[PDB]
Every structure is written in C-alpha cells, then in structure tokens.
Ligand binder design. Sequence first.
Ligand SMILES: Nc1ncnc2c1ncn2[C@@H]1O[C@H](COP(=O)(O)OP(=O)(O)OP(=O)(O)O)[C@@H](O)[C@H]1O
Ligand SMILES: Nc1ncnc2c1ncn2[C@@H]1O[C@H](COP(=O)(O)OP(=O)(O)OP(=O)(O)O)[C@@H](O)[C@H]1O
Ligand SMILES: Nc1ncnc2c1ncn2[C@@H]1O[C@H](COP(=O)(O)OP(=O)(O)OP(=O)(O)O)[C@@H](O)[C@H]1O
Ligand SMILES: Nc1ncnc2c1ncn2[C@@H]1O[C@H](COP(=O)(O)OP(=O)(O)OP(=O)(O)O)[C@@H](O)[C@H]1O
Ligand SMILES: [Mg+2]
Ligand SMILES: [Mg+2]
Ligand SMILES: [Mg+2]
Ligand SMILES: [Mg+2]
Lengths: 413, 219, 411, 82, 149
Amino acid sequence: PIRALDEGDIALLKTYGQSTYSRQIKQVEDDIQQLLKKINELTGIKESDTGLAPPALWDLAADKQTLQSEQPLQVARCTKIINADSEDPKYIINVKQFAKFVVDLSDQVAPTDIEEGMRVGVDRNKYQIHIPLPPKIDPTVTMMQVEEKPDVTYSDVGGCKEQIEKLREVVETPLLHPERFVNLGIEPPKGVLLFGPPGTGKTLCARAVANRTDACFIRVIGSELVQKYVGEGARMVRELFEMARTKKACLIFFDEIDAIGGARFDDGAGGDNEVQRTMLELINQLDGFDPRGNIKVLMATNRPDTLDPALMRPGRLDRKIEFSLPDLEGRTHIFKIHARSMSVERDIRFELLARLCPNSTGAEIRSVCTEAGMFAIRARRKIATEKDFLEAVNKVIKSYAKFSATPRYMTYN
Amino acid sequence: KGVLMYGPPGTGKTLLARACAAQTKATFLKLAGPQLVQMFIGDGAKLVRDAFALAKEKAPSIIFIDELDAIGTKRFDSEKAGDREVQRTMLELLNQLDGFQPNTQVKVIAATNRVDILDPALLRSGRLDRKIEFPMPNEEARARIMQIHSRKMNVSPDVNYEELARCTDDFNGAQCKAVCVEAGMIALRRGATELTHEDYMEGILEVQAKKKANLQYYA
Amino acid sequence: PTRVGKKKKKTKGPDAASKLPLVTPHTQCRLKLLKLERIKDYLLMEEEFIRNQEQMKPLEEKQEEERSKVDDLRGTPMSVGTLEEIIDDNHAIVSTSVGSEHYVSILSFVDKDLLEPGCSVLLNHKVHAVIGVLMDDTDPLVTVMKVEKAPQETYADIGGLDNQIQEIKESVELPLTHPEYYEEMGIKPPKGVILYGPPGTGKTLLAKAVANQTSATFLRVVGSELIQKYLGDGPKLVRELFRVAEEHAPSIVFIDEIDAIGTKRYDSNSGGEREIQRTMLELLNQLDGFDSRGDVKVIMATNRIETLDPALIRPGRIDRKIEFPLPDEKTKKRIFQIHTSRMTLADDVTLDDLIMAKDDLSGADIKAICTEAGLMALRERRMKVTNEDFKKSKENVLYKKQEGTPEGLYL
Amino acid sequence: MGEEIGAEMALRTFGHLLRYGEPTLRRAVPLALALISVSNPRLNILDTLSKFSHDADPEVSYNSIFAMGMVGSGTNNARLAA
Amino acid sequence: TPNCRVALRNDSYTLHKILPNKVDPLVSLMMVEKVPDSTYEMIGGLDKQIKEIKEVIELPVKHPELFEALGIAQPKGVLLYGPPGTGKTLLARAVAHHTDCTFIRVSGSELVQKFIGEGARMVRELFVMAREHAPSIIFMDEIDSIGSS
Ligand SMILES: Nc1ncnc2c1ncn2[C@@H]1O[C@H](COP(=O)(O)OP(=O)(O)OP(=O)(O)O)[C@@H](O)[C@H]1O
Ligand SMILES: Nc1ncnc2c1ncn2[C@@H]1O[C@H](COP(=O)(O)OP(=O)(O)OP(=O)(O)O)[C@@H](O)[C@H]1O
Ligand SMILES: Nc1ncnc2c1ncn2[C@@H]1O[C@H](COP(=O)(O)OP(=O)(O)OP(=O)(O)O)[C@@H](O)[C@H]1O
Ligand SMILES: Nc1ncnc2c1ncn2[C@@H]1O[C@H](COP(=O)(O)OP(=O)(O)OP(=O)(O)O)[C@@H](O)[C@H]1O
Ligand SMILES: [Mg+2]
Ligand SMILES: [Mg+2]
Ligand SMILES: [Mg+2]
Ligand SMILES: [Mg+2]
C-alpha cells in the first residue's frame, strides 16, 4: 500500500524551498562549464612544430637546389646479391620481401666491387646497380651496449666477503692475469648463475662489476627476445653471438632468465612455442659445434627451481654462487654503510640494531635507515636518536612479521 | 640411413658427433634445430630442400641435426598461422627422406634430449630408425672421464678415481668435468702447486653448491 | 661537456582543471551566487580578449616566402617512415612499413642532431624524400591513461583517516613541495606504496584526493589494461608507460587492482599463462631493476595482500604498507556528518543511535544509508528526514551479509 | 597569443601578485625562462628572470636559480646579468 | 574526435567526411533493435518489487533535480535474486518495452572468448560505447558465471 508519485505532486517539490536562487545559482554553473569548452576551441593553439631547422641556415638550399634535387635525384633501393657469372654481369639479386631479379650493372660502377652478399643501390625502373653500400650492423645491440658507468664500488656490497671472492675469480682475474691458469694448466669457468632470495644483492654485484670492468659489457633486456613474429626472436640471438666473436673478451649479462624459458613441455599440444625456439637457439650458440672462446655469461634469478636442466648443465652455467642472509657481522657492516651519510647521534651502537633484524635482507636494512629519519621529520629534529631507530624496527619488521607473539609473549622470558 | 641419439642431457651427444666429424673426411654438414624456422612464408622448406640437394651433390656427405625436438613436435590445428608453416618445413624433411632410396652415402644423424616431443609414428620404418641411447656413466665410466680431463694438471699420485666414484653418484659426464675444473682453482686459493684427494672432495660439494660448518651434534 | 643535450629540451604539461575550488558556503546563499558570477566575469573577458586577439591582426606576411614554398616543397600527402642507418652525405637510408628501403636524400631544413635509428621521420611519395621528422610518437593506448581532470574534493571530503593521510603525504606531496628536509639527512623519499584492506574502505578515494591536490601530472591504470594477445604486446606497453612518465614531469603513476598482476610466480602447464606471467615479471625489472628510476612514484592497491608475489612486496620497490581497517565508534561520526551535509535534517535524529548499537559496517555502507533514507522521505511524501527513515534504511542496507559464525561455545 | 605585451613585460604580474611562492607559477615562469628565446633583447626575458625571485619567505627554489646560474655563467652572458 | 574514422580520397589523400559508427564488431548481441516484447501489466503480483525499480531507474532519469534539491547521490545498482521461475526475466523485458532509453543486453558468459586480454578489454569497450547513447540501461544474464569468487 505504498505509492506516492503523481505528476501534479511533482510540481510540489521544485517550488518549495529557495525558489529564488535554485535555477539562479544553477544555470550560472551550467553556462560557465559551457564557457570552459568555448574557450578551448577558441584557443586552438596545439602547435606540434617539428622537423624544421632554425630558419636562418637552409635559405641557400631551398632557393633552387631543392628544386634541383627533385627530378635528377633518385629514389633507388638497396638489396642483396646472391652471385655473379663470368664474362657478363648476370647478377642474381634478392630483396627478401619483393621478388628476385636478374639484372645488369650500370655505367657508374666498377665491376670489381660487386662482391656477393653486398648491399647495393638498385634503380627503380631497369633495376641496375648504382652504388654499393657498407654492410648492415644490427641496430638493437648498439642500443644495449651500455657505454655508461653505474657508480657502485665493491665497498657497498658488504656482508658478501666470499661471494665476491668466487665472482672475482671468474670475471676479473683471467682478464687481467691470463697466465696462472695456463702456467698451472687449468681453464677458468665461463658461466655463473646467481640465485637466492629477493632483495639480497643480485643486481648490486652486476652493477658493481660494470664499474670495474675495463672491457666490453652488454646488458641484455630480457623481453626483447620475445617478439610478435615467428622466428624473429631467434634471429636476435644470432646477431648477439656474432659481434661478441669480433672483439675480444666481451661480457654479456642476462637478467631474469626465468622469463625467456624455464621448462620444455607439450601436453595440450601448444603454448609457449615461439619462446622455446628462441630459448633453444640460445643453447646451441652456448655449447655445441664452434665453441665461443672468450664470451662470459652472467645470469641472475629469483626462482632457480623452475629452470630447464639444459641450462643447469655445467659447460653452459658452471658456478652456482648463491646469496644468503648475513649472520651478524654482515649486518653490522651493512648499517655502517647505509647510515654513514646521514645526520645521526655520534654515540649510538649498531650491534643492538643488528640483533633485532634476525631474518632480514640488505633492502630491509636500508628501509630501516630511511624510515628512522622520517620520524625525525615527524618531530622537529635534524639528528637521529637511538629511539628513532628503535621505533623504525617496529614499523618495518614488527608491524608485519609478528602480531600474536609480541603481546602474548609470556612463554619465552 | 637414420640414426637417432637420445638420453639425459649431459652424456655427450654433441661430444660424440664432433669426433665423427674429426676423424672422417666425408663432407660433414652440421645443422641446428631452430635454424629452419624463418619469418616469411615458405622459407624453411627452401632451406630444408636446398641443403639436401647440396648434400646430394657431394657423394660421401653426411648430415647432423641437433635438437630435432625444436621442430619435431606434436602437430596441432590452429586458425592464426603460427605453427602452420613448421609442418611444411617438417613434411619437406619427411618427403625428402622418403624421396631417395636408402643406399648408404647420405646417412643422416639426429639427436634430441627428450623423446616424448618427437613424432614416433612418423619415423618408425625407413626414416630415422636406429636407436642409440646414451645412459649415465655407471661407476668406472665416471672414474674414466675424471681421469681424462685431469690429464693436463699436476696431480699428486695419491688419488684413486675409484675412491672418487664411491662418493660421486648420479652425475652425468659434464658434472664429472665440472669437478675436475673446480678442484684446480681450490688449490689456487691457498696457492697449492699440486692436487690432493681432499682437493677433489671440496670440488664435489661446490658442484651442487654445498658447504659445511661445525654442526655441534657430532662431538 | 658538462651539460650535454641540456636534458631533452622538454617542458611539462600539467592539468588545467581546478579553476576555483572555493564554493565554501556550500548552501543556497547569495555568496555562491556572487562568487560564481565573478567566475563568469573573468571567463567571458578571457573569451572576449582572445576574440579581440584573432580580430585585430593586420599583420600578413604569411611566411616571408620561406616556409610557404617549403610547405609546397613537401608533398601534401605527408607519409611516415623509419630510419635504419644514417649515411651522412645528405643521402640516408630509411625503411617503410612493409620494409621497402630507399636510398633517399635529405631535402634540407632538418638539423642532423635529433635523428637516431628508431626515430620515425616524414617522407614523400613521388621521390620519398625526407621532409621532416615525426615527434613524440606515442602509441594511442597510453595517452588514454593520462588524466586531465581533478575529479572530486580534497582531503576534507573523506571522513577522518588522518593517521594514514599523513603517511601518503610524506611520500608524494611533501617531497615535491618541500625537499629541503631530506638533504639535511641525505635520505631519499620512499617510492612505492601499497593500499590494502577490506573492500569499501577508502582506497579509491585516497588516490582521487591526491590527484585533485597535486602539481605534477597523473596516470591511472585499471588493472588488466596492459594485457594483450600478441605475445610481446604485453611487456612492450609497460616500457612505453614508464617512458612517457619519465619524459614528462616528475610525476606519479597510480596502478590499481594489482591482484590481477601478481600471484607468487609459480610455473605451470598453460601457455597463455606465461605471457601473463612474463609481462608481470618485467614490470619488476622496470621498477627497481637496472639503471636508475627517475622521479616516478608508484601507488598500488588491492583487497587481498597475501596472494601477491613476494618479489614485489620487498623494499626497494615498495617501502610503505598501509592498512585500511573498518572504522571505529569515533571517526564513524565524521562519516555520517559529511554524507549528511546538504540534506534537510530534522531535529529528532541522533547520529549515535545507529553507530553505537551496531559495530560492523564500512564507509561505503554509510553512503548507502544516507541515500536510502532520502528515498524513504519521498516514499512517504516528505522533505525532512527523521529517525524512522534511518530505522528502515539501516535494515535494508545491511541485509546483504549473512547471519553469523558460531554458536555460544565461547563465553 | 601576444607579442611585445607578453614576451617583454607581462611576467611582472607574478612579480607583483604574490611573494609567497607555490609551484604553479614558480614552475610556469621557467617554461618561458629555460627557453630564453634569445632572439629578442634577452634582458627582457632576463628581467623576467630577475623578479621571478621576487617571492620572499626562503624556499627550496635554489634548485632553479643555481642550475640556471650554471648555464648562466657562460651562456646568458655574464657581461649583462651576472 | 581522436580514434574516429574519416573518409579519405584516393585522389590526393585529402580528407572527405567524418565517418560515424565507430569500430565495434560485436554489438550484434548488444542493443537489440526491435522490442515488440511483453507488456508491463502481465507481471501480476510483484508490486513491491516493481515500485522499487521505478525509484532507481525511472525517477533519476525523469527527474534528476529532485536528488539535487534533496542532496544525495543517485543509485545505480540493482540485484535480482530468488528461486528459479519467479519472474526475473519478464521484468527485464517489461522495463525494456517501456524504458524510452537505450537498452544494452549482455548475457553473462561471452566475456571469455579464447585469447587472453582481448577476452577482457571488450568489457571496457562495452561500457565506453554506452557513453555514446548517454542514458542507457545495461543488463546481466545469470551471474553464476564470471563474478563468482
Ligand atoms: N649485501 C648488501 N650490502 C649493502 N646493501 C645491500 C646488500 N644487499 C642489498 N642491499 C641494498 O638493497 C637494495 C636492493 O637490492 P637488489 O635489488 O640489488 O637485490 P636483488 O637481489 O638484485 O633483488 P632481485 O632478486 O629482486 O633482483 C640495493 O639498492 C642495496 O642498496
Ligand atoms: N663420455 C665422455 N667422455 C669425455 N667427456 C665427456 C663425456 N661425457 C660428457 N663429457 C664432457 O661433458 C660435456 C657435455 O657433452 P656435450 O657437449 O656433448 O653435451 P650433451 O650431452 O650433448 O648436451 P645436450 O645433450 O643437452 O646437447 C662435454 O663437453 C664433454 O667435455
Ligand atoms: N573514510 C571515508 N570517508 C568518507 N567516505 C567514504 C570513506 N570510506 C569510503 N567512503 C565512501 O566509499 C566510496 C569509495 O569507495 P572505496 O574508495 O572504499 O573503494 P575501494 O576501497 O577501491 O573498494 P574496492 O577495494 O572494493 O574496489 C565513496 O563513494 C565514499 O563515499
Ligand atoms: N509472476 C509471473 N507472472 C506471469 N508469468 C510468470 C511469472 N513468473 C514467471 N512467469 C513465467 O516464467 C517464464 C519466465 O521465467 P523467469 O522470468 O522467471 O526467468 P527465471 O526462471 O527466473 O530464470 P531462470 O530460469 O534462470 O531461473 C515466462 O514464461 C513467464 O510467463
Ligand atoms: Mg635485481
Ligand atoms: Mg648437444
Ligand atoms: Mg578500488
Ligand atoms: Mg532468466
């Protein structure tokens, strides 16, 4: 028995209570939002100006020479040559996208420098060779040659006095003393994997050897190997393992090789097929016929269990350096690294702080050092006290690691 | 005319085929698995057939194919191309291999690590047929290989490789090579001039990445 | 040199909204009639001044003969190409979309200083010649995720969360407004923030209030937004996402519902599962992997937190974990007070009737109670809202959550 | 959309409107100052450099002025505006 | 408009006309053209249930200024539940016969397709197509599918 609407009762509502300023305030807000629009299309000042030089230098070119470089200039294409025959051109030339022609040389060429597999400038009408080219270099390995120093010294990787000692043996020592390996009769390993918990210092050891290398170092973006086209990712592998053979002793660092292939299965007849072709091409240019010589490979992962046993074989990855948690002497050295460059009280002790971080990483220790200064900005201070750090330990660890054991603690004292 | 190698992936499949290319002069033709996959349409069957016509021009030429399971997969139907050029590269391998009579001169060698990817009914009769499996080294074959790679070092002559095969178990041929490499550098740590049985035992634990403390149970 | 390239010559475009967020009478008063008419005065004059600006221009030279022939020198159907290599004899090599590569010349007025293999250029059809170079080259999927409007009200809109309001301000607003405190201790501000808790608590509001009161730009990402099917299209959009944020202002990125972007990184049997899992593994790389980061902040939000990948929860990536619990009997008063701002409230009601008697319900429950009780007044022909509206509304909203847990075992 | 009115003189509003400082206008002026637009008698735009710092109550604005002073030693000639 | 099709002359690549009816190959199922469906009064005995739907659908569309003057946000969510065979789908078709509005029918099981990512994004393309017909009602069939847990 509840119904309360009828068109006459609609006219009750919108006249009761501020009949003076109801529409008087509303349409002012309405047409100003219309006026927000009508300013915008009246401006219209987008101005995507690009391509043009400063207009004080090209004046000589675009007087007649630009008109002189329309009709006499050529729109010739570049191609590749298969071979040649004797006494004549008989040149067999492909495009790999267009067809394959058999054409003649032109007048402006020397018939000696028409060697096979050479990029050559080809006419559009009669398709004659005009200009030979320098060979093609791969465009994306140039993008990932680092050419840049990240600034991390070995004095910042504290807590790892022995993991650096294993890593010093493989990378640095044959590149500076290639004598004692031969003068005793051994060979250095050529592949090192890094595995362990996250935030432990995997990237730091890779970032610090890019500082002190004195050699070719190549970061490799992992998901550039995965492409849209079939077989394209496998071709990217090849160009990487050719130019490494040209120069001597270049370093290649992969990172998170969990992504580029971890297991080879087929039960539902399909899946990560194209990823396997790129991943198996990586294997055959790692071991197989034509061993690589002086190419050192570094890999790092967080989930080492799910990797292919084809990569777990030594000869491809030879040293298994793992990272663990620093016991106590490691952590007391880590606090002195991450808190030396901050305004603290000059009398505090750090060994009491290293107690209260039992199962912690180097990332978690630095988060305590940053958070303790944030409490100093909650108050109005410019130096850190002891209780600033003690509240920071409870904020980082104890706010997430335990909630039942701290209040109801009376089983342990 | 068809020989297939299979087994666990550390036994020496590639290591065996390099020696056959070494001592024989009969125009060895290496070929990898994922080399036949190309981006444009129909290019792999060009690359399959031209190399087989090349190896037919030379009489004694024999062909090695590594990771045949890179293309030798259970073929599945689709609607967005994808694998629908690989079988045209696969069947061209199947058409050419049945294309000529089995007169021994162009013997073909293949080798995979996992059998369960390959197409078993597609070989079975006159295709890749001979099964040469590579098992793991038993006891003395481990002690033989560790003696092979230790030929080039200063080994003190109180080391029995049979005593090493006591503690080394379930290893392939490459992990036996890895013990031999790591033991040379442990002696390099303390600057030792020759090796010892203790030097190998620490090199064993480094392969599977172990370490030992004082465990306070053991007096 | 010391100042190589002077950092990409690039300005920043922030928002144009928030013209005048001062309507502070908040009721039918003549002040808001007076204030908005002032806003009408300035925008009409801004219209009429620029109307006079395009009117009284007797300057015509067009381009003093230089750019006018140049605009006729270039073709009218201007096309788009791609550099492969640079042969610097004013005759370079390019690549089309199909891969047809042409030994084209450089037809001038282009400085050979900002063209790199990968930078897209402008070409002709009759001679295919390089006329200009295409700039900014953004794929139109990331420009959709660029917010231009401040949607809702400021921090005074939400009903009291001040312990956790001061947390997010320490990492977003305060380092950008006043970074003089941090250099005195050399401490970089935190980067990543997780908002987690039960649903209906205020996660989406806290991002919108930050996007209202800010100075840098803003980017929103709705969950499964960076997921495609072309096996490399997934991780490629993530690179362009952080590229745009880095090239523009020192701004923040809000990626919401990251429970569909991470679960513990296990390996399994499905092939479409991996292009899911791989895109979500290189977001890890762009965030706190190699090189550096720039001034890019990331704010993430879920309902459940334990089903996430532990590689994302670690510090270095995310330094703040913020709980949003269900409210109390004190700040709940502020929820009822704000959502009953502009409604005709009868004097019979007591706000503490429904608060103290029942002690379970979210902030989004309270907005539904205020709207339902207003519907009950029109349901029985009223303008003012009494206690009897809230008696029926507190019933009707809460009957969507089940009866109970266990019987009286505990005592 | 100006000429001599805008690109010579119209920044003295911000040197007259407030002296408190807030990053809306404090960042909008180096949009037209880092772009010096040197084709004019640039001390017009460098006059707009001068009372861009016409905001009192000392701030973190040292990041702008010292970095523009670094490009302002060699370029933006020290004969005129050092 | 950005992301809008135009007519391009093949003569000199000059623009010719803005082309409406933007790219959407999957609104065959949505926005049913004809409604000679059932009527409003043959529901017969659900009057408490029917009048609540007027409050949430008819009333904000017909008279939005009431919620302005009263000072509350307007509701937008409706859930219908019960045992099977209790008039759940007539009430969809009875509203759709009398809505004077755009009616977008979505059954609750075609949002999976077969490829990951495109099985999702058309839901985002669904609702942004509802901005074109600016008043609209979108209906769900049988959410015991996607939306479970
Ligand atoms: N042993 C250490 N000494 C000093 N600082 C450390 C150490 N380990 C980690 N850190 C600090 O933790 C931060 C994060 O470490 P990092 O990201 O390199 O760990 P990771 O193992 O590479 O992580 P992931 O496994 O996810 O790649 C570093 O910036 C570093 O400052
Ligand atoms: N029986 C053996 N005698 C001597 N050396 C061996 C033997 N087995 C393995 N090795 C050593 O181990 C390495 C592994 O051999 P190989 O390179 O053939 O790998 P593989 O078993 O073919 O791997 P995959 O099958 O995965 O390709 C060789 O380099 C070789 O030095
Ligand atoms: N503390 C609060 N003060 C005022 N209003 C609130 C508060 N918390 C929630 N609300 C109400 O809740 C709505 C916002 O929802 P909220 O931000 O909680 O979504 P959410 O947390 O993202 O939910 P979900 O996690 O389910 O997506 C707003 O309409 C607002 O009116
Ligand atoms: N109150 C009613 N008056 C008239 N016809 C009804 C009534 N209730 C159900 N029906 C009949 O039931 C059929 C419609 O089914 P309904 O709308 O109940 O879907 P439903 O059965 O709830 O959906 P489901 O099968 O998924 O439960 C029509 O034939 C309709 O005539
Ligand atoms: Mg790392
Ligand atoms: Mg092999
Ligand atoms: Mg939310
Ligand atoms: Mg039904």
